[PDB]
Design a binder for this molecule. Structure first.
Ligand SMILES: NC(=O)C1=CN([C@@H]2O[C@H](COP(=O)(O)OP(=O)(O)OC[C@H]3O[C@@H](n4cnc5c(N)ncnc54)[C@H](O)[C@@H]3O)[C@@H](O)[C@H]2O)C=CC1
Ligand SMILES: NC(=O)C1=CN([C@@H]2O[C@H](COP(=O)(O)OP(=O)(O)OC[C@H]3O[C@@H](n4cnc5c(N)ncnc54)[C@H](O)[C@@H]3O)[C@@H](O)[C@H]2O)C=CC1
Ligand SMILES: Nc1ncnc2c1ncn2[C@@H]1O[C@H](CO)[C@@H](O)[C@H]1O
Ligand SMILES: Nc1ncnc2c1ncn2[C@@H]1O[C@H](CO)[C@@H](O)[C@H]1O
Ligand SMILES: [Cl-]
Ligand SMILES: [Cl-]
Ligand SMILES: [Cl-]
Ligand SMILES: [Cl-]
Lengths: 388, 403, 388, 403
């Protein structure tokens, strides 16, 4: 079975979930409990569900899945007694109905996505609050929403912010890897303009220089501009920089980092990419307004042909240009399972507030990972403990 | 349209090929000549074929495409009068038949891939040697094979080894062969590279790129070698060097980049950890001994697309990517556009040098003429708007003197 | 004159002090004021004194100077009407007497070193507090002492912490530059052990790997150990690591990072260096105790020959292994002059507390530096200000 | 004692030279031969002389030491029976006389510095050519000068160019010549490099190291060149390339690393900014035209130790380091110990190859024999305890075949 084969592949490479099953699948700490989940359904998340089931949980899952591609995985989970509501979830009203179906099962613990199950539970499905004991939230958007819910005084259950989004060549390595993958263009020997020289922009500039680019930085803060100069970059106004730029990367946290005049000064073939959080830095609406032709040049690359006859290329529709390997999801899933187990053990002692993941869980998972790698480390002596 | 769009993208970023067309497309120096090619077919190589055609050549191509893709690019080439045989080339006998199809056109010049067409011309299709005036070869495997023909006195045409180029040392191959190799591995496996033991067999241009990229991804890299100079290089790059027999004991990934045969033995294979992943970046599929895997395995199964599981007599299962064939070219991003533009420029000028000089050349493998490297470097500078200094007469006499 | 020539050299390359003189030497804002200074006396600090004099100040300086090497600079300052007490300052009681001599001049503003003039003014020389209007303190030790003085409720004058100690290949670049300079040894192809993987240790490890070393990390924190593994380093206990180490660099903030057994396992010729703040990390006393012979191998390198016949080398007597260029001191001096001018203008409105250098001064100096380099930067639009 | 302590330090970290002594000091292959040397004298080069003496050679040395230092090292060598003439060599006529002193000893082999001794032997001291059996030359300037003797038919002894070595490309020269050059500049000037415009003339081994180190220190680097290949390399490294005439207009530092003459013209000099700092890293002091500075300057003065101010007709003052002589060797840290150990090993084996083979060699400049690079790489691996793989017979036949 293709679904079973997908799961078998990931099962080979999720050592922490395998260790958690070895340690807890006889005790079955979640026997008699239901765990409701909203997650993107694929073999890796399936294995999290399977692991929770080995620990005794009744697992009920909604998959946010706009294609049919992982239906084989859904069907394999259903064969293992796990309840899966994932078909037709391209429609928004069906995703919400599937969330309602998870809540129909009166979950004891929720592994949420974006806070969706939890917010519904507090607003339209309050009857589930009786049985709901705790929520684990791994998404940054979810933790924000549940903190905002706390701040209104409406949160009724403990929430753990699993808070594992924190994750060699610095912060700019991922950005340039994505730019290279999406364009297949050389960075060496090119003029790269970086707008903003905070931690993000500096990383992007340093990596570009390591790839062999000549780097120009734009800034509005004189202190930051001096820093860029002392790192060996050229600083000049954007109006000048766009005239020679092969790449322009916005890292400013600002709006309209390029004007209409700036765009009309770009070289034919210039590549634009945003490394900030929102699509306002490169004014996509301005490109759409002034272009005489818009086309898909490559996957994730949009060409805009301008009134001056030149074409410029925008990566990823102006969104953050920079979906994880099996072992990384194994680590994230281990932290999430331990969060649910912590809530199981301690929820009666916890307030209806958002807690940061207890540091003990980070240390337990790290130790388990070292153990699975065969790595040994040092231990503090008595003299060293007395010193610290 | 999709084929044409792919070619349109690369055309915008191939300034040397575009300058070559500007300089020679009116003169048509290759008018009345056929250029035979063996390539991995994709937009960049299509642009090389297009440029040769603009110079007047009849261009006939076979694509080593076991991937079974780029048909759109093939159709775009066909609409421009370029003959392309790339379909079904996963089957080795179909790739060979397509080589024979190229030779049926009696090429005047060959731009080869690994010496494939040239070796056949010397061993099975000797009738084509009459008309064949010169070969351009870019790969280390091809140059080795053609040097082996020379050394035994069987080579009958002049060959220019373009891989000699001074500008090979220009680019850092970690974001050519390295990045494309690791992207392919990551796509086929979805496995983490960070914190893994990665073994690279061979520390030449290809293997060093693969090793540096793996270290960049957070792997601990172990290098195997037979050349002590190369092994010292690996050490000085910060890697561990040891014999394969030891390296296999701890390897999570083993990547072959040697150009040799049987870089793993049966005994090496039986020492691999359960779940080890094996991949080849060399020309031929004999580096990892696929036949040995097939022979000793208790069970064989397809684990996922492009991943074959082999369960061994010791109970362990090892995974082979892409049937031991070269892993990194199927996505069409083996090297950056501008790097291929440079490489292709050198190749075009090698062909033009053979056109001009072949009557004067022996049936030997020649290093790329230095004049070609300098031509292409100058055209690159000009395309960037860069000016440099010129020696004075005083300086020229100083350099020719002993003080 | 050799003193005059030293000053002339630095004068050519201190563009911010030259600009400050151009802007203020007609106004003479410090005319009628005395500025007392304790500083290491050399051509660069002389030029700060000269600049303050051009601004009208009577300048009275004590030099902490244990050699006679800058006596020519002292004599050139005296020729310009600046009062200098720097001879024989190798003796500690003479340094203190020279500080007393500065305080005899009843300074209006002090540019202190280590808080020495200020603490004396508050404890033994309280009569100077009448006329003392403000203190500028650039040293980290000085700011600590004056903050501690504040915390006892005994500080009587405003103090500005000039707070410019904040200063391409990361934090490890300076460390390795120093190790290379002091040993003349190759780093490529060596085994480097880094003890601790906080920001300091990580920087040192990353730079070592960039130099071509094979890097081993030791740690006591499993979370940090995992980080080092995912950066591509080998993690093992120090007891194992010392057996193969060519270099051992301590970056732990701990004591006795190497034991006696660890030291006796080092290879003949191993090099040890501390990148932490205190000389407890590598137990220098233990090396001194167990060595059969101690010698100076090279400047800044001590050899210890052990009972096992092997010799190991310690850099910089176990102190932080990693004194600035003219233009860097120009920047520091500009911030200090502006701190004194800020105190001049505002001291009547300030409490007797330690203030951080006002951000306006950082921005003014940065802008002056950009201006002197001919660099132009961008300016926020109205839309951008409204967005932020 | 201080001299001996300096030598004791380097001896601990020169494993190849120590292994050479272990292997050949009992046999004494150089017994009855004199080896003449021109070196910058310091502990590392002293260890090379010591090692040659352990092999039986009579060693006679002149030190290019314009610095006026390492007398302690000279005295240590004298106590070991090695003849050293290094004092007062700031004066060019004294350095030349010391070269003549080496030639007075009728060396059988010369280890040269820039071809100095060999060129004199051919031009002024031809009587020594009878006994001279071979020359080893490590520098690009030396090889050029000796090639110029060959090309005019004036060379009379075989020369091995050790700079050909495969292992030059091993090390990254930013922490050899680069770091030592910038340390010297920083010592002589106390000026900031970060945020400055640095111009490097020449992008070979020396200049690329200087440029990369400057970029590492935070400089904006501009490269000048006459070779288009080298200029493209500089571009691909992230540097700006332009003609010197333009580069001088914005330069804070100009560093010459060309091996040529008159890399600045009078017109270039008159375009420099007030306060520009000029330094040379080439062999000879003609790269920066010191005589032109001396001729056109309105005033000349010593600004600080090792720094000459020249005030020009345009009112601007420019500063020259070390009288335009090579700036980076005076501190004795030109390269790391282990790098010089490698280089010296190659040189010793070059001498031993000449001892064995000179009767069979033409009076030509030869590339370093590949066998020597492989010997030294293997000894390096052995010293590190590294083992590598050996080719099988199947593999050897595969590599000699054309498939
Ligand atoms: N995948 C791709 O994109 C590309 C593939 N290639 C192919 O990759 C192969 C390697 O090419 P290059 O790096 O240019 O060759 P190279 O000759 O520069 O390096 C190959 C290295 O393998 C070493 N080696 C040979 N047999 C070995 C063994 N049994 N164990 C360990 N090391 C061994 C050699 O000593 C040599 O240093 C060739 O087949 C070449 O055609 C090359 C370039 C592109
Ligand atoms: N300071 C030191 O520690 C060392 C000094 N040297 C010396 O440095 C010099 C350079 O040596 P390498 O880098 O090995 O030589 P190289 O031949 O590799 O590079 C010199 C470069 O200078 C370029 N060039 C020549 N004339 C030029 C001009 N007028 N303007 C700009 N570029 C020009 C050439 O095209 C070449 O690329 C030689 O004199 C050599 O003996 C080399 C090694 C050590
Ligand atoms: N319009 C802009 N252009 C360039 N840099 C900017 C702009 N707006 C903000 N920044 C800078 O971006 C960095 C990250 O917010 C800050 O250092 C800030 O000064
Ligand atoms: N004895 C030690 N050995 C190694 N790392 C240590 C030791 N003591 C503290 N550290 C680590 O050093 C880093 C900086 O304090 C921290 O990550 C801490 O865990
Ligand atoms: Cl590891
Ligand atoms: Cl990388
Ligand atoms: Cl700059
Ligand atoms: Cl550097």
């Amino acid at each position: 079975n293709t679904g079973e084969m997908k799961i078998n592949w990931v099962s080979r490479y999720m050592p922490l979930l395998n260790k958690i099953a070895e340690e807890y699948s006889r005790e079955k700490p979640l026997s008699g409990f239901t765990v409701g989940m909203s997650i993107h359904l694929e073999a890796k998340t399936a294995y999290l569900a399977i692991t929770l089931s080995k620990l005794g949980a009744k697992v009920v899952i909604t998959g946010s899945n706009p294609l049919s591609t992982q239906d084989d995985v859904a069907e394999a989970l259903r064969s293992k007694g796990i309840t899966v509501y994932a078909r037709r979830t391209h429609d928004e009203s069906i995703y919400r109905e599937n969330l309602m179906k998870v809540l129909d099962e009166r979950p004891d613990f929720i592994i949420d996505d974006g806070g969706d199950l939890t917010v519904i539970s507090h607003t339209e499905r309050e009857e589930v609050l009786e049985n709901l004991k705790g929520v684990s939230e791994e998404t940054t958007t979810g933790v924000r929403r549940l903190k905002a819910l706390e701040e209104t005084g409406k949160l009724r259950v403990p929430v753990i912010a699993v808070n594992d989004s924190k994750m060699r060549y610095g912060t700019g390595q991922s950005t340039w890897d994505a730019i290279m993958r999406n364009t297949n263009l050389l960075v060496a020997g090119k003029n790269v303009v970086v707008a903003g020289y905070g931690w993000c922009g500096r990383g992007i500039a340093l990596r570009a220089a390591g790839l062999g680019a000549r780097v120009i930085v734009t800034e509005v803060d004189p202190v930051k501009a001096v820093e860029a100069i002392m790192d060996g970059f050229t600083v000049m106004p954007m109006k000048e920089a766009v005239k020679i730029a092969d790449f322009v990367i916005t890292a400013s946290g600002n709006t309209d980092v390029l004007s209409k005049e700036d765009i009309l000064s770009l070289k034919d073939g210039a590549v634009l990419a945003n490394a900030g959080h929102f699509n306002v830095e490169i004014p996509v609406r301005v490109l759409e307004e002034i272009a005489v032709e818009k086309f898909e040049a490559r996957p994730n690359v949009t060409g805009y042909t301008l009134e001056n006859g030149k074409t410029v290329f925008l990566l990823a529709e102006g969104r953050l240009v920079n979906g994880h390997p099996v072992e990384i999801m194994d680590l994230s899933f281990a932290l999430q399972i331990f969060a649910v187990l912590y809530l199981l053990e301690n929820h009666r002692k916890m307030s209806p507030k958002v807690y940061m993941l207890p540091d003990e869980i980070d240390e337990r998972v790290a130790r388990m990972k070292l153990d699975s790698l065969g790595v040994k480390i040092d231990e503090l002596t008595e003299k060293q403990r007395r010193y610290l």
